[PDB]
Protein backbone atom coordinates (compact mmCIF):
# COMPACT_ATOMS: atom_id res chain seq x y z
CA UNK A 1 0.00 0.00 0.00
CA UNK A 2 2.12 2.86 1.33
CA UNK A 3 5.22 3.92 -0.57
CA UNK A 4 8.22 1.86 0.49
CA UNK A 5 6.22 -0.83 2.31
CA UNK A 6 7.19 -3.53 -0.20
CA UNK A 7 10.89 -2.82 0.28
CA UNK A 8 10.37 -2.79 4.05
CA UNK A 9 8.55 -6.15 4.05
CA UNK A 10 11.35 -7.70 2.00
CA UNK A 11 14.02 -6.35 4.36
CA UNK A 12 12.06 -7.67 7.35
CA UNK A 13 11.95 -11.12 5.74
CA UNK A 14 15.69 -10.94 5.13
CA UNK A 15 16.27 -10.01 8.78
CA UNK A 16 14.01 -12.81 10.02
CA UNK A 17 15.91 -15.37 7.93
CA UNK A 18 19.28 -14.06 9.09
CA UNK A 19 18.23 -14.20 12.75
CA UNK A 20 16.94 -17.78 12.27
CA UNK A 21 20.11 -18.82 10.41
CA UNK A 22 22.18 -17.61 13.38
CA UNK A 23 20.04 -19.69 15.74
CA UNK A 24 20.33 -22.81 13.57
CA UNK A 25 24.01 -22.76 12.47
CA UNK A 26 26.49 -22.02 15.29
CA UNK A 27 29.58 -21.85 13.03
CA UNK A 28 28.66 -19.02 10.67
CA UNK A 29 30.67 -17.90 7.66
CA UNK A 30 31.83 -14.81 9.57
CA UNK A 31 33.21 -17.00 12.37
CA UNK A 32 34.73 -19.47 9.90
CA UNK A 33 36.56 -16.84 7.83
CA UNK A 34 38.13 -15.35 10.95
CA UNK A 35 39.59 -18.78 11.73
CA UNK A 36 40.79 -19.39 8.17
CA UNK A 37 42.53 -16.00 7.96
CA UNK A 38 44.14 -16.30 11.40
CA UNK A 39 44.32 -21.85 16.28
CA UNK A 40 43.02 -25.10 14.75
CA UNK A 41 45.04 -28.29 14.59
CA UNK A 42 46.20 -28.91 11.01
CA UNK A 43 45.79 -32.36 9.51
CA UNK A 44 48.11 -32.33 6.50
CA UNK A 45 49.12 -36.01 6.12
CA UNK A 46 48.25 -39.43 7.50
CA UNK A 47 50.67 -39.06 10.41
CA UNK A 48 49.15 -35.78 11.60
CA UNK A 49 45.69 -37.35 11.22
CA UNK A 50 46.67 -39.95 13.82
CA UNK A 51 48.07 -37.22 16.09
CA UNK A 52 44.86 -35.24 15.52
CA UNK A 53 42.78 -38.03 17.06
CA UNK A 54 44.19 -36.94 20.43
CA UNK A 55 43.86 -33.15 20.18
CA UNK A 56 40.19 -33.42 19.15
CA UNK A 57 37.48 -35.85 20.26
CA UNK A 58 35.74 -37.11 17.11
CA UNK A 59 32.42 -38.86 17.65
CA UNK A 60 32.32 -41.31 14.70
CA UNK A 61 35.12 -43.75 15.60
CA UNK A 62 33.91 -47.25 16.47
CA UNK A 63 39.73 -49.07 9.71
CA UNK A 64 41.72 -47.70 6.75
CA UNK A 65 42.28 -43.96 6.80
CA UNK A 66 40.44 -43.05 3.59
CA UNK A 67 37.36 -44.94 4.81
CA UNK A 68 37.50 -43.30 8.23
CA UNK A 69 37.67 -39.80 6.72
CA UNK A 70 34.65 -40.60 4.57
CA UNK A 71 32.68 -41.90 7.57
CA UNK A 72 33.64 -38.75 9.47
CA UNK A 73 32.14 -36.71 6.64
CA UNK A 74 28.98 -38.81 6.78
CA UNK A 75 28.64 -38.30 10.54
CA UNK A 76 28.90 -34.57 10.05
CA UNK A 77 26.37 -34.55 7.20
CA UNK A 78 23.82 -36.27 9.45
CA UNK A 79 24.33 -33.50 12.01
CA UNK A 80 23.96 -30.94 9.23
CA UNK A 81 20.64 -32.40 8.10
CA UNK A 82 19.22 -31.77 11.57
CA UNK A 83 20.43 -28.16 11.57
CA UNK A 84 19.04 -27.50 8.09
CA UNK A 85 15.73 -29.10 9.07
CA UNK A 86 15.47 -26.73 12.03
CA UNK A 87 16.28 -23.77 9.81
CA UNK A 88 13.65 -24.79 7.26
CA UNK A 89 10.92 -24.47 9.92
CA UNK A 90 11.69 -20.75 10.23
CA UNK A 91 11.22 -20.08 6.51
CA UNK A 92 7.76 -18.45 6.33
CA UNK A 93 5.25 -20.84 4.82
CA UNK A 94 7.35 -23.98 5.11
CA UNK A 95 5.63 -25.58 8.13
CA UNK A 96 2.20 -24.95 6.61
CA UNK A 97 2.97 -26.98 3.50
CA UNK A 98 1.76 -30.55 3.14
CA UNK A 99 3.81 -32.72 5.52
CA UNK A 100 4.97 -35.05 2.77
CA UNK A 101 6.07 -32.10 0.66
CA UNK A 102 8.12 -30.77 3.59
CA UNK A 103 9.91 -34.13 3.86
CA UNK A 104 10.44 -34.19 0.09
CA UNK A 105 11.86 -30.67 -0.02
CA UNK A 106 14.38 -31.54 2.69
CA UNK A 107 15.26 -34.94 1.23
CA UNK A 108 16.24 -33.43 -2.13
CA UNK A 109 17.52 -30.08 -0.85
CA UNK A 110 19.90 -30.90 2.00
CA UNK A 111 22.85 -31.96 -0.18
CA UNK A 112 22.82 -28.68 -2.13
CA UNK A 113 22.71 -26.81 1.16
CA UNK A 114 25.47 -28.94 2.67
CA UNK A 115 27.83 -28.12 -0.19
CA UNK A 116 26.83 -24.43 -0.11
CA UNK A 117 27.58 -24.16 3.58
CA UNK A 118 30.73 -26.26 3.29
CA UNK A 119 32.16 -23.50 1.06
CA UNK A 120 31.92 -21.15 4.06
CA UNK A 121 34.37 -23.44 5.87
CA UNK A 122 36.79 -23.76 2.92
CA UNK A 123 39.63 -21.84 1.38
CA UNK A 124 41.66 -22.86 -1.65
CA UNK A 125 43.96 -24.93 0.59
CA UNK A 126 41.67 -26.82 2.98
CA UNK A 127 38.55 -27.07 5.13
CA UNK A 128 37.63 -26.49 8.76
CA UNK A 129 36.49 -29.62 10.61
CA UNK A 130 35.23 -30.40 14.14
CA UNK A 131 33.33 -27.15 14.65
CA UNK A 132 36.38 -25.14 13.63
CA UNK A 133 38.88 -26.91 15.90
CA UNK A 134 40.67 -28.69 13.04
CA UNK A 135 41.74 -27.84 9.51
CA UNK A 136 42.32 -30.55 6.92
CA UNK A 137 44.38 -29.68 3.88
CA UNK A 138 43.10 -29.98 0.35
CA UNK A 139 46.38 -31.63 -0.65
CA UNK A 140 45.95 -34.36 1.95
CA UNK A 141 42.37 -35.07 0.84
CA UNK A 142 43.55 -35.23 -2.79
CA UNK A 143 46.23 -37.78 -1.80
CA UNK A 144 43.75 -40.43 -0.64
CA UNK A 145 43.51 -43.60 -2.68
CA UNK A 146 40.97 -44.03 -5.44
CA UNK A 147 38.13 -43.34 -5.32
CA UNK A 148 38.43 -41.26 -2.15
CA UNK A 149 41.08 -38.88 -3.51
CA UNK A 150 38.53 -37.14 -5.74
CA UNK A 151 35.72 -37.15 -3.16
CA UNK A 152 36.31 -33.60 -1.85
CA UNK A 153 38.17 -31.98 -4.75
CA UNK A 154 35.05 -30.98 -6.79
CA UNK A 155 33.69 -29.38 -3.59
CA UNK A 156 36.86 -27.27 -3.29
CA UNK A 157 36.66 -26.27 -6.96
CA UNK A 158 33.06 -25.12 -6.45
CA UNK A 159 33.93 -23.34 -3.21
CA UNK A 160 36.78 -21.26 -4.60
CA UNK A 161 34.53 -19.90 -7.34
CA UNK A 162 31.56 -19.51 -5.00
CA UNK A 163 33.59 -17.74 -2.32
CA UNK A 164 34.84 -15.29 -4.94
CA UNK A 165 31.27 -13.87 -4.88
CA UNK A 166 32.01 -12.69 -1.28
CA UNK A 167 28.55 -13.51 0.06
CA UNK A 168 27.98 -12.99 3.74
CA UNK A 169 25.74 -14.78 6.21
CA UNK A 170 22.81 -12.43 5.55
CA UNK A 171 23.05 -13.25 1.82
CA UNK A 172 23.45 -16.98 2.46
CA UNK A 173 20.43 -17.22 4.77
CA UNK A 174 18.16 -16.18 1.92
CA UNK A 175 20.00 -18.19 -0.75
CA UNK A 176 19.63 -21.37 1.33
CA UNK A 177 15.92 -20.69 1.79
CA UNK A 178 15.49 -20.30 -1.99
CA UNK A 179 17.18 -23.71 -2.55
CA UNK A 180 14.91 -25.41 -0.01
CA UNK A 181 11.73 -23.98 -1.56
CA UNK A 182 12.36 -25.59 -4.96
CA UNK A 183 9.14 -26.55 -6.70
CA UNK A 184 10.84 -28.97 -9.11
CA UNK A 185 11.73 -31.72 -6.61
CA UNK A 186 10.51 -35.18 -7.67
CA UNK A 187 7.27 -36.31 -6.09
CA UNK A 188 5.95 -32.98 -4.79
CA UNK A 189 2.16 -32.91 -4.45
CA UNK A 190 1.36 -29.16 -4.37
CA UNK A 191 3.95 -27.31 -6.48
CA UNK A 192 2.14 -23.95 -6.71
CA UNK A 193 2.36 -22.90 -3.01
CA UNK A 194 6.07 -23.81 -2.97
CA UNK A 195 6.74 -21.66 -6.04
CA UNK A 196 4.71 -18.83 -4.47
CA UNK A 197 6.88 -18.92 -1.35
CA UNK A 198 10.01 -19.13 -3.48
CA UNK A 199 8.89 -16.06 -5.48
CA UNK A 200 8.84 -14.00 -2.30
CA UNK A 201 12.19 -15.42 -1.20
CA UNK A 202 13.70 -14.59 -4.60
CA UNK A 203 12.38 -11.02 -4.30
CA UNK A 204 14.05 -10.78 -0.88
CA UNK A 205 17.33 -12.25 -2.16
CA UNK A 206 17.42 -9.88 -5.12
CA UNK A 207 16.92 -6.78 -2.95
CA UNK A 208 19.44 -8.04 -0.36
CA UNK A 209 22.12 -8.44 -3.04
CA UNK A 210 21.33 -5.08 -4.63
CA UNK A 211 21.69 -3.27 -1.31
CA UNK A 212 24.57 -5.29 0.15
CA UNK A 213 26.64 -5.62 -3.06
CA UNK A 214 25.72 -2.68 -5.31
CA UNK A 215 29.11 -2.87 -7.05
CA UNK A 216 28.57 -6.52 -8.00
CA UNK A 217 26.84 -6.27 -11.35
CA UNK A 218 24.18 -8.96 -11.86
CA UNK A 219 25.16 -10.83 -8.69
CA UNK A 220 21.59 -12.12 -8.36
CA UNK A 221 21.80 -13.79 -11.76
CA UNK A 222 25.30 -15.09 -10.97
CA UNK A 223 24.01 -16.66 -7.77
CA UNK A 224 21.12 -18.32 -9.59
CA UNK A 225 23.68 -19.76 -11.99
CA UNK A 226 25.46 -21.25 -8.97
CA UNK A 227 22.19 -22.86 -7.83
CA UNK A 228 22.16 -24.56 -11.21
CA UNK A 229 25.79 -25.63 -10.67
CA UNK A 230 25.08 -27.16 -7.25
CA UNK A 231 22.63 -29.57 -8.93
CA UNK A 232 25.53 -30.87 -11.02
CA UNK A 233 27.79 -31.20 -7.97
CA UNK A 234 25.18 -33.24 -6.14
CA UNK A 235 24.50 -35.55 -9.10
CA UNK A 236 28.24 -36.23 -9.28
CA UNK A 237 28.39 -36.91 -5.55
CA UNK A 238 25.53 -39.43 -5.73
CA UNK A 239 27.38 -41.25 -8.53
CA UNK A 240 30.39 -41.68 -6.27
CA UNK A 241 28.17 -42.85 -3.38
CA UNK A 242 27.02 -45.65 -5.70
CA UNK A 243 30.63 -46.52 -6.51
CA UNK A 244 31.62 -46.73 -2.83
CA UNK A 245 28.90 -49.24 -1.94
CA UNK A 246 29.43 -51.49 -4.97
CA UNK A 247 33.17 -51.35 -5.84
CA UNK A 248 34.28 -50.71 -2.25
CA UNK A 249 33.56 -53.85 -0.23
CA UNK A 250 31.86 -53.14 3.15
CA UNK A 251 28.14 -53.82 3.07
CA UNK A 252 25.86 -55.78 5.44
CA UNK A 253 27.74 -55.21 8.70
CA UNK A 254 26.20 -53.30 11.64
CA UNK A 255 22.58 -52.92 10.47
CA UNK A 256 21.63 -50.26 13.03
CA UNK A 257 24.48 -48.01 11.89
CA UNK A 258 23.40 -48.59 8.29
CA UNK A 259 19.95 -47.37 9.34
CA UNK A 260 21.14 -44.04 10.76
CA UNK A 261 22.97 -43.50 7.44
CA UNK A 262 20.41 -44.78 4.94
CA UNK A 263 19.88 -41.45 3.13
CA UNK B 1 12.02 -21.80 29.23
CA UNK B 2 8.31 -22.63 29.00
CA UNK B 3 8.24 -21.50 25.36
CA UNK B 4 11.26 -23.67 24.53
CA UNK B 5 9.58 -26.72 26.10
CA UNK B 6 6.40 -26.16 24.09
CA UNK B 7 8.46 -25.72 20.92
CA UNK B 8 10.24 -28.98 21.74
CA UNK B 9 6.88 -30.71 22.25
CA UNK B 10 5.66 -29.40 18.88
CA UNK B 11 8.86 -30.43 17.11
CA UNK B 12 8.69 -33.99 18.43
CA UNK B 13 4.99 -34.36 17.54
CA UNK B 14 5.69 -33.17 13.98
CA UNK B 15 8.62 -35.56 13.62
CA UNK B 16 6.48 -38.39 15.03
CA UNK B 17 3.74 -37.79 12.44
CA UNK B 18 6.42 -37.79 9.74
CA UNK B 19 8.04 -41.03 10.98
CA UNK B 20 5.11 -43.29 11.97
CA UNK B 21 2.39 -43.75 9.31
CA UNK B 22 -0.02 -45.62 11.63
CA UNK B 23 -0.51 -43.25 14.55
CA UNK B 24 -2.66 -43.92 17.59
CA UNK B 25 -5.30 -41.55 16.22
CA UNK B 26 -5.51 -43.53 12.98
CA UNK B 27 -5.49 -46.84 14.84
CA UNK B 28 -8.30 -45.74 17.17
CA UNK B 29 -10.35 -44.59 14.18
CA UNK B 30 -9.97 -48.07 12.66
CA UNK B 31 -10.72 -49.90 15.93
CA UNK B 32 -13.90 -47.87 16.51
CA UNK B 33 -15.17 -47.86 12.90
CA UNK B 34 -14.74 -44.17 12.04
CA UNK B 35 -12.84 -44.48 8.75
CA UNK B 36 -14.10 -44.55 5.19
CA UNK B 37 -12.52 -47.94 4.63
CA UNK B 38 -13.73 -51.50 4.85
CA UNK B 39 -13.49 -52.83 8.39
CA UNK B 40 -10.33 -54.84 9.09
CA UNK B 41 -10.46 -58.57 8.53
CA UNK B 42 -10.79 -60.40 11.86
CA UNK B 43 -8.48 -63.37 12.46
CA UNK B 44 -9.82 -65.48 15.34
CA UNK B 45 -8.85 -69.08 14.48
CA UNK B 46 -6.82 -71.17 12.04
CA UNK B 47 -9.37 -71.01 9.21
CA UNK B 48 -9.69 -67.23 9.37
CA UNK B 49 -5.91 -66.93 9.58
CA UNK B 50 -5.73 -68.81 6.33
CA UNK B 51 -8.29 -66.52 4.67
CA UNK B 52 -6.26 -63.52 5.88
CA UNK B 53 -3.75 -64.57 3.23
CA UNK B 54 -6.19 -63.51 0.56
CA UNK B 55 -7.99 -60.67 2.38
CA UNK B 56 -4.85 -58.79 3.51
CA UNK B 57 -2.20 -57.25 1.24
CA UNK B 58 7.13 -68.82 4.58
CA UNK B 59 6.70 -71.05 7.64
CA UNK B 60 3.69 -73.33 7.31
CA UNK B 61 3.17 -73.98 11.03
CA UNK B 62 0.80 -71.60 12.71
CA UNK B 63 2.74 -70.48 15.75
CA UNK B 64 5.95 -69.88 13.79
CA UNK B 65 4.10 -68.02 11.13
CA UNK B 66 2.50 -65.70 13.67
CA UNK B 67 5.89 -65.30 15.34
CA UNK B 68 7.59 -64.41 12.06
CA UNK B 69 4.86 -61.87 11.27
CA UNK B 70 5.63 -60.18 14.58
CA UNK B 71 9.33 -60.16 13.75
CA UNK B 72 8.79 -58.52 10.39
CA UNK B 73 6.64 -55.84 12.04
CA UNK B 74 9.48 -55.13 14.48
CA UNK B 75 11.94 -54.81 11.61
CA UNK B 76 9.68 -52.14 10.07
CA UNK B 77 9.26 -50.42 13.44
CA UNK B 78 13.02 -50.26 13.99
CA UNK B 79 13.38 -48.37 10.72
CA UNK B 80 10.67 -45.87 11.70
CA UNK B 81 12.05 -45.46 15.23
CA UNK B 82 15.59 -44.82 13.95
CA UNK B 83 14.25 -42.09 11.66
CA UNK B 84 12.42 -40.57 14.63
CA UNK B 85 15.42 -40.81 16.95
CA UNK B 86 17.61 -38.78 14.60
CA UNK B 87 15.12 -35.91 14.94
CA UNK B 88 15.43 -35.76 18.73
CA UNK B 89 17.56 -32.64 19.35
CA UNK B 90 21.03 -33.70 20.48
CA UNK B 91 20.77 -37.38 19.47
CA UNK B 92 22.86 -37.27 16.29
CA UNK B 93 25.47 -35.21 18.12
CA UNK B 94 26.20 -38.01 20.61
CA UNK B 95 29.11 -40.38 20.18
CA UNK B 96 28.12 -42.76 17.38
CA UNK B 97 28.66 -45.89 19.48
CA UNK B 98 26.22 -44.45 22.02
CA UNK B 99 23.66 -43.67 19.29
CA UNK B 100 23.78 -47.34 18.35
CA UNK B 101 23.53 -48.49 21.96
CA UNK B 102 20.53 -46.26 22.65
CA UNK B 103 18.70 -47.72 19.64
CA UNK B 104 19.74 -51.31 20.46
CA UNK B 105 18.36 -51.20 24.02
CA UNK B 106 15.46 -48.81 23.41
CA UNK B 107 13.67 -50.01 20.27
CA UNK B 108 11.71 -52.82 21.95
CA UNK B 109 10.47 -50.59 24.78
CA UNK B 110 9.16 -48.26 22.07
CA UNK B 111 7.78 -51.13 19.98
CA UNK B 112 5.64 -52.35 22.89
CA UNK B 113 4.59 -48.80 23.82
CA UNK B 114 3.34 -48.18 20.31
CA UNK B 115 1.86 -51.67 20.03
CA UNK B 116 -0.55 -50.64 22.79
CA UNK B 117 -1.86 -47.89 20.48
CA UNK B 118 -3.11 -50.64 18.17
CA UNK B 119 -4.60 -52.81 20.95
CA UNK B 120 -7.84 -53.07 22.82
CA UNK B 121 -8.82 -55.68 25.39
CA UNK B 122 -9.99 -58.04 22.63
CA UNK B 123 -7.22 -57.98 20.02
CA UNK B 124 -4.62 -56.11 18.00
CA UNK B 125 -4.45 -54.37 14.63
CA UNK B 126 -2.05 -55.92 12.11
CA UNK B 127 -0.81 -55.14 8.59
CA UNK B 128 -1.24 -51.37 8.67
CA UNK B 129 -4.76 -51.69 10.10
CA UNK B 130 -5.93 -54.13 7.40
CA UNK B 131 -6.41 -56.95 9.91
CA UNK B 132 -7.43 -57.50 13.51
CA UNK B 133 -6.10 -60.54 15.38
CA UNK B 134 -7.99 -61.61 18.48
CA UNK B 135 -6.39 -61.81 21.91
CA UNK B 136 -8.07 -65.19 22.52
CA UNK B 137 -6.58 -66.67 19.34
CA UNK B 138 -3.11 -65.46 20.30
CA UNK B 139 -3.51 -67.14 23.71
CA UNK B 140 -4.40 -70.51 22.12
CA UNK B 141 -1.06 -71.06 20.40
CA UNK B 142 1.04 -74.09 21.24
CA UNK B 143 3.94 -73.94 23.65
CA UNK B 144 6.23 -72.07 24.06
CA UNK B 145 4.00 -69.44 22.44
CA UNK B 146 1.29 -69.91 25.07
CA UNK B 147 0.20 -66.49 26.39
CA UNK B 148 3.25 -64.83 24.81
CA UNK B 149 1.19 -61.77 23.82
CA UNK B 150 -0.74 -61.76 27.09
CA UNK B 151 1.85 -59.59 28.92
CA UNK B 152 1.58 -57.10 26.06
CA UNK B 153 -2.23 -57.06 26.23
CA UNK B 154 -2.18 -56.72 30.02
CA UNK B 155 0.18 -53.76 29.72
CA UNK B 156 -1.83 -52.13 26.91
CA UNK B 157 -5.13 -52.24 28.82
CA UNK B 158 -3.57 -50.35 31.73
CA UNK B 159 -1.52 -48.08 29.48
CA UNK B 160 -4.47 -47.10 27.28
CA UNK B 161 -6.45 -46.16 30.40
CA UNK B 162 -4.01 -43.24 30.73
CA UNK B 163 -5.68 -41.76 27.61
CA UNK B 164 -2.45 -40.47 26.05
CA UNK B 165 -2.58 -39.09 22.54
CA UNK B 166 0.08 -38.99 19.84
CA UNK B 167 1.44 -35.63 21.00
CA UNK B 168 2.06 -37.09 24.48
CA UNK B 169 3.50 -40.35 23.12
CA UNK B 170 5.99 -38.49 20.91
CA UNK B 171 7.68 -37.03 23.98
CA UNK B 172 7.40 -40.23 26.04
CA UNK B 173 9.13 -42.25 23.30
CA UNK B 174 11.94 -39.71 23.13
CA UNK B 175 12.40 -40.01 26.91
CA UNK B 176 12.73 -43.80 26.45
CA UNK B 177 15.40 -43.50 23.73
CA UNK B 178 17.49 -41.07 25.78
CA UNK B 179 18.02 -43.48 28.68
CA UNK B 180 21.38 -43.07 30.39
CA UNK B 181 21.27 -46.53 32.01
CA UNK B 182 21.71 -48.62 28.85
CA UNK B 183 24.52 -51.19 29.13
CA UNK B 184 27.81 -50.10 27.63
CA UNK B 185 27.10 -46.41 27.12
CA UNK B 186 30.41 -44.55 26.87
CA UNK B 187 29.24 -41.04 27.84
CA UNK B 188 26.22 -41.18 30.15
CA UNK B 189 26.01 -37.51 31.14
CA UNK B 190 25.14 -35.90 27.74
CA UNK B 191 22.32 -38.44 27.42
CA UNK B 192 20.94 -37.72 30.89
CA UNK B 193 21.05 -33.97 30.15
CA UNK B 194 18.90 -34.42 27.04
CA UNK B 195 16.53 -36.75 28.89
CA UNK B 196 16.16 -34.15 31.67
CA UNK B 197 14.98 -31.58 29.12
CA UNK B 198 12.63 -34.12 27.54
CA UNK B 199 11.19 -34.95 30.98
CA UNK B 200 10.59 -31.24 31.59
CA UNK B 201 8.79 -30.99 28.25
CA UNK B 202 6.77 -34.15 28.95
CA UNK B 203 5.67 -32.88 32.37
CA UNK B 204 4.46 -29.61 30.84
CA UNK B 205 2.76 -31.36 27.91
CA UNK B 206 0.81 -33.63 30.24
CA UNK B 207 -0.26 -30.81 32.55
CA UNK B 208 -1.54 -28.75 29.61
CA UNK B 209 -3.11 -31.60 27.60
CA UNK B 210 -4.60 -33.46 30.61
CA UNK B 211 -5.17 -30.81 33.28
CA UNK B 212 -7.68 -33.03 35.10
CA UNK B 213 -5.48 -36.17 35.23
CA UNK B 214 -3.85 -36.20 38.66
CA UNK B 215 -0.20 -37.28 38.72
CA UNK B 216 -0.34 -38.48 35.11
CA UNK B 217 3.38 -37.73 34.68
CA UNK B 218 4.29 -40.03 37.58
CA UNK B 219 1.87 -42.73 36.45
CA UNK B 220 3.33 -42.64 32.95
CA UNK B 221 6.88 -42.91 34.29
CA UNK B 222 5.79 -45.88 36.41
CA UNK B 223 4.79 -47.66 33.18
CA UNK B 224 8.48 -48.21 32.48
CA UNK B 225 8.32 -50.97 35.11
CA UNK B 226 5.73 -52.71 32.96
CA UNK B 227 7.75 -52.04 29.77
CA UNK B 228 11.10 -53.29 31.04
CA UNK B 229 9.36 -56.38 32.43
CA UNK B 230 7.84 -57.06 29.01
CA UNK B 231 11.28 -56.86 27.41
CA UNK B 232 12.98 -59.09 29.99
CA UNK B 233 10.19 -61.67 29.72
CA UNK B 234 10.44 -61.65 25.95
CA UNK B 235 14.21 -62.23 26.01
CA UNK B 236 13.54 -65.21 28.29
CA UNK B 237 10.92 -66.50 25.84
CA UNK B 238 13.49 -66.28 23.03
CA UNK B 239 15.76 -68.53 25.09
CA UNK B 240 12.95 -71.10 25.37
CA UNK B 241 12.26 -70.80 21.64
CA UNK B 242 15.90 -71.62 20.90
CA UNK B 243 15.36 -74.97 22.63
CA UNK B 244 11.88 -75.87 21.35
CA UNK B 245 12.18 -74.96 17.66
CA UNK B 246 14.17 -76.10 14.67
CA UNK B 247 15.78 -73.66 12.26
CA UNK B 248 14.72 -70.07 13.07
CA UNK B 249 15.76 -67.63 10.34
CA UNK B 250 16.11 -64.16 11.89
CA UNK B 251 16.32 -60.81 10.14
CA UNK B 252 19.83 -59.27 10.37
CA UNK B 253 18.42 -56.28 12.24
CA UNK B 254 16.93 -58.40 15.01
CA UNK B 255 19.98 -60.63 15.26
CA UNK B 256 22.12 -57.53 15.90
CA UNK B 257 19.65 -56.15 18.45
CA UNK B 258 19.43 -59.42 20.37
CA UNK B 259 23.19 -60.04 20.21
CA UNK B 260 24.27 -60.13 23.78
CA UNK B 261 26.42 -57.11 24.34
C1 LIG C 1 40.83 -37.99 13.53
O1 LIG C 1 39.55 -38.56 13.22
C2 LIG C 1 39.12 -38.03 12.05
C3 LIG C 1 38.47 -38.84 11.13
C4 LIG C 1 38.03 -38.29 9.93
C5 LIG C 1 38.24 -36.94 9.65
O2 LIG C 1 37.83 -36.43 8.46
C6 LIG C 1 36.83 -35.51 8.49
C7 LIG C 1 36.66 -34.67 7.39
C8 LIG C 1 35.64 -33.71 7.39
N1 LIG C 1 35.44 -32.89 6.36
C9 LIG C 1 36.22 -33.12 5.13
C10 LIG C 1 34.46 -31.77 6.44
C11 LIG C 1 33.08 -32.25 5.97
O3 LIG C 1 33.20 -32.55 4.58
C12 LIG C 1 32.08 -33.10 4.02
C13 LIG C 1 32.23 -33.80 2.83
C14 LIG C 1 31.15 -34.39 2.19
C15 LIG C 1 29.89 -34.27 2.76
C16 LIG C 1 28.80 -34.86 2.12
C17 LIG C 1 28.46 -36.19 2.83
S1 LIG C 1 29.67 -37.53 2.69
C18 LIG C 1 28.50 -38.63 2.10
O4 LIG C 1 28.73 -39.80 1.80
N2 LIG C 1 27.29 -38.05 1.99
C19 LIG C 1 27.25 -36.75 2.35
O5 LIG C 1 26.20 -36.10 2.31
C20 LIG C 1 29.75 -33.56 3.95
C21 LIG C 1 30.83 -32.98 4.60
N3 LIG C 1 34.83 -33.63 8.46
C22 LIG C 1 35.00 -34.49 9.56
N4 LIG C 1 36.03 -35.44 9.56
C23 LIG C 1 38.91 -36.14 10.57
C24 LIG C 1 39.35 -36.68 11.76
C1 LIG D 1 -2.09 -63.06 6.94
O1 LIG D 1 -0.83 -63.67 7.26
C2 LIG D 1 -0.48 -63.43 8.56
C3 LIG D 1 0.74 -63.91 9.04
C4 LIG D 1 1.10 -63.67 10.36
C5 LIG D 1 0.26 -62.94 11.20
O2 LIG D 1 0.59 -62.74 12.51
C6 LIG D 1 0.87 -61.45 12.88
C7 LIG D 1 0.67 -61.06 14.19
C8 LIG D 1 0.96 -59.73 14.56
N1 LIG D 1 0.77 -59.28 15.80
C9 LIG D 1 0.43 -60.25 16.85
C10 LIG D 1 0.89 -57.84 16.12
C11 LIG D 1 2.36 -57.47 16.41
O3 LIG D 1 2.70 -57.97 17.69
C12 LIG D 1 4.04 -57.97 17.91
C13 LIG D 1 4.54 -58.77 18.92
C14 LIG D 1 5.89 -58.81 19.18
C15 LIG D 1 6.78 -58.02 18.46
C16 LIG D 1 8.16 -58.07 18.76
C17 LIG D 1 8.99 -58.90 17.75
S1 LIG D 1 8.74 -60.68 17.91
C18 LIG D 1 10.32 -60.98 18.39
O4 LIG D 1 10.76 -62.09 18.68
N2 LIG D 1 11.06 -59.86 18.38
C19 LIG D 1 10.38 -58.76 18.02
O5 LIG D 1 10.95 -57.67 18.00
C20 LIG D 1 6.28 -57.18 17.46
C21 LIG D 1 4.91 -57.15 17.18
N3 LIG D 1 1.44 -58.88 13.64
C22 LIG D 1 1.65 -59.28 12.32
N4 LIG D 1 1.36 -60.61 11.96
C23 LIG D 1 -0.97 -62.49 10.73
C24 LIG D 1 -1.34 -62.73 9.41
Author numbering:
A (entry chain B): 202 to 239, 245 to 268, 275 to 475
B (entry chain A): 207 to 263, 273 to 476
Please give the exact wording used by the authors of the publication that reports this structure.
The final model of PPARγ-lobeglitazone consists of two monomers of the PPARγ LBD (referred as A and B chains), two molecules of lobeglitazone, and 454 water molecules. The A-chain corresponds to the canonical active conformation of the PPARγ LBD with H12 in an active position, and the B-chain has an inactive conformation with H12 protruding away from the molecule. Lobeglitazone, with its molecular volume of 577 Å3, occupies 44% of the ligand-binding cavity, which is 10% more than the space occupied by pioglitazone (34%). The contacting surface area of the p-methoxyphenoxy group is 90 Å2, contributing 22% of the contact area of lobeglitazone to the binding pocket. The two nitrogen atoms of pyrimidine ring of lobeglitazone make hydrogen bonds with the two water molecules nearby. The lobeglitazone bound to the B chain displays slightly weak electron densities and higher B-factors than the ligand in chain A, owing to the lack of hydrogen bonding to H12. The binding of lobeglitazone to chain B, which displays an inactive conformation of H12, suggests that the extensive hydrophobic interactions significantly contribute to the high affinity of lobeglitazone to PPARγ.
PPARγ which is mainly expressed in adipose tissue, liver, and skeletal muscle, regulates the genes involved in adipocyte differentiation and lipid metabolism. Upon agonist binding, the conformation of the ligand binding domain (LBD) is altered to expose the binding cleft for the recruitment of transcriptional coactivators, which initiate the transcription of target genes. The PPARγ LBD is composed of 13 helices arranged into a three-layered sandwich and a three-stranded β-sheet, with the C-terminal AF-2 helix (H12).
